[PDB]
Design a binder for these strands. Structure first.
Ligand code: ADP
Ligand code: ALF
Ligand code: MG
Ligand code: MG
Length: 613
RNA sequence: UUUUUU
């Protein structure tokens, strides 16, 4: 009440089809193909796999593609394979390794076609989770089943042994609201935690997970929708001194993060287990009988590290990973759950949840749903928000400990009805050893006006902006020269195109300060929700005469972008395009009134008189 | 709408 489901079968019959809409739509939307006139060069790898090389008049490493032969000089043929080489410093040849070496039409070279194959794994796991919820009644407790379905059911009290102290060593001393939040959550089967940015939702989550783990009843499962949110929580949990295993996507095994040392795939390789460490050093070959012992041993190692972990951390979709099947979790916490669709949250939930904690802020980013029809039918509504509408009262945090009061003013008043209070002062937020000259000494922020125009990026739907990129670099140098360390600086931008451009431009050219720049985080705004830096630089990218600003129209995205910094925020963008949207127009006027809308050379900034719509 | 996930 009011939204109710008779049972989990009806529930699946509603969300199952929604997920299918979104899946089918994304597939159609992300799938592209060449003309059927590609010329192929055939070869064999050293390992005797079959390879096709070709040039293209926008693929990425590891992509899956279908190669079709459409000519008449051999039987019609199609084969699946994956990109093992893209155009680079060795040449413009794309190479793909085929799954199956035969019977490829290696005697012909013309009249081929290349289709990019959209990967369906993430939606498969959501469909699969929905089915498990409906068919297997042991996948969640009777209580949680009834609560999730909107049934009336008496409140249940979990009678655990409460800790001596709620606040946990290694983490900040909890304030009264966080203590209340921890103490209360431990005793309920279902809890929602809510609060504006930087109120310690993740700190509080880590403290809860710590106590649930110390109950000694098996590993706690901990998730978030995006890899970066999972990593924040993982690091905080690690600080409590617990044994944490970060389970990563197979496709991310070569991505570098500050919690890489906790990644399951890395822990296994640092194990002894000397034999398996030998078969790994060997596959780094491909022997088929050797792969049998490799796998068995690997399964033995994964089983060991996972079963003995106090906590397992992974994305919501990652929870559906085959390595975790046949595992059950009594206690599950999902951080930044408001950024996920409900079927995405259900992925970890159906692993046997008897106690479930959801953390969120609906004023920050929601899930990505490209199919407007599906979004409007409800796929856009998170589980956290449905439960709020159903009457579950969230536990609230309201006092912020991240940012200088001047950074919190606009977001607090605009997004949170002035209810975001400050737990730190201006004096708590003067960087020691930092000799930077702010336009307004008392306001560590400014919007740096940048004339320019966006370009469409390699991908075809994303944008970049070369002028802003240039200024981002200048500003970064200025900050570094003022005394900021690389790791105290973060650069965020809403677009992937701009993110990638910045990586190449700052980190992989020959720049004099390349080694410094490489220690500087660059990321999309969306990925960075949940993370914080001392100093943030935001590149807005959009800059055009009559093409709009795209998803910059979403207030949630600006909110996240404005609330990542502790000590200072510098915004780089073009007020001309931004001003056309009421929200950005208001942020621009706000900065103008604060005298931090500026122009000119960095060492000699002047207010921008420039007028905008 | 071009972002999250695999
Ligand atoms: N009770 C507290 N005392 C001191 N610092 C705190 C406290 N609670 C949170 N913080 C800090 O403020 C920041 C934001 O916490 P975080 O958990 O990331 O916010 P949120 O999860 O709500 O976005 C961190 O740097 C963190 O250590
Ligand atoms: F709510 Al946050 F970093 F997770 F501000
Ligand atoms: Mg958080
Ligand atoms: Mg460089």
């Amino acid at each position: 009440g009011h939204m109710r489901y008779e049972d989990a079968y009806q529930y699946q019959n509603i969300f199952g089809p929604l997920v299918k809409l979104e899946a089918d739509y994304d597939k159609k939307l992300k799938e592209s193909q060449t003309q059927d006139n590609i010329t192929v060069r055939w070869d064999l790898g050293l390992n005797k796999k079959r390879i096709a090389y070709f040039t293209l008049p926008r693929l990425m490493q590891g992509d899956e593609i279908c190669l079709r032969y459409k000519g008449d000089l051999a039987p019609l043929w199609k084969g699946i394979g994956h990109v093992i080489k893209v155009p680079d410093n060795y040449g413009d040849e794309i190479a793909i390794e085929l799954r199956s070496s035969v019977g490829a039409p290696v005697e012909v070279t013309h009249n081929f076609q290349v289709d990019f194959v959209w990967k369906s794994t993430s939606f498969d796991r959501m469909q699969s989770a929905l089915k498990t919820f409906a068919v297997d009644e042991t996948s969640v407790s009777g209580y949680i089943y009834h609560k999730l379905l909107g049934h009336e059911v008496e409140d249940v009290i979990i009678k655990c042994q409460l800790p001596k102290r709620f606040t946990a060593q290694g983490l900040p001393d909890l304030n009264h609201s966080q203590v209340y939040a921890v103490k209360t959550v431990l005793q309920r089967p279902l809890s929602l935690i809510q609060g504006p940015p930087g109120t310690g939702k993740t700190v509080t989550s880590a403290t809860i997970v710590y106590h649930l783990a110390r109950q000694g009843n098996g590993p706690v499962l901990v998730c978030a929708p995006s890899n970066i949110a999972v990593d924040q929580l993982t690091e905080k949990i690690h600080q409590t001194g617990l044994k944490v295993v970060r389970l990563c996507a197979k496709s991310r095994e070569a991505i570098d993060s500050p919690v890489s040392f906790l990644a399951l795939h890395n822990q296994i390789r640092n194990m002894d287990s000397m034999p398996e460490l030998q078969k790994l050093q060997q596959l780094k070959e491909l022997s088929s009988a050797d792969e049998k012992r490799y796998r068995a041993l690997k399964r033995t190692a994964e089983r060991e590290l996972l079963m003995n972990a106090d906590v397992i951390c992974c994305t919501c979709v990652g929870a559906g990973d085959p390595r975790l099947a046949k595992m059950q979790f009594r206690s599950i916490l999902i951080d930044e759950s408001t950024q996920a669709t409900e079927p995405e949250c259900m992925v970890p939930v159906v692993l046997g949840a008897k106690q479930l904690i959801l953390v969120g802020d609906h004023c920050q980013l929601g899930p990505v749903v490209m199919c407007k029809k599906a979004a409007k039918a409800g796929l856009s509504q998170s589980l956290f928000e449905r439960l709020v509408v159903l009457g579950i009262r969230p536990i609230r945090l309201q006092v912020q400990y991240r940012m200088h009061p001047a950074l919190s003013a606009f977001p607090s008043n605009i997004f949170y009805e002035g209810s975001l209070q400050n737990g730190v002062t201006a004096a708590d937020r003067v960087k020691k050893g930092f000799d930077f000259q702010w336009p307004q000494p008392d306001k560590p922020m400014f919007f740096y006006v940048t004339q320019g125009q966006e370009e469409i990026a390699s991908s075809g739907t994303s944008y970049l902006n070369r002028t802003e990129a240039a200024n981002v670099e200048k500003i970064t140098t200025k900050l570094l020269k003022a005394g900021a360390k690389p790791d105290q600086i973060g650069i965020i931008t809403p677009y992937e195109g701009q993110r990638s451009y910045l990586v190449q431009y700052m980190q992989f050219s020959g720049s004099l300060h390349t080694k410094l720049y490489q220690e500087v985080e660059i990321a999309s705004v969306d990925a960075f929700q949940g993370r914080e830096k001392d100093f943030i630089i935001l590149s807005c990218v959009r800059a055009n005469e009559h093409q709009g600003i795209g998803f910059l129209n979403d207030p949630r995205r600006l909110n996240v972008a404005l609330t990542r910094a502790r000590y200072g925020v510098i915004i780089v963008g073009n007020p001309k395009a931004l001003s056309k949207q009421p929200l950005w127009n208001h942020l621009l006027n706000y900065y103008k009134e604060q005298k931090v809308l500026v122009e000119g050379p960095l060492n000699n900034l002047r207010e921008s008189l420039m007028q905008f719509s």
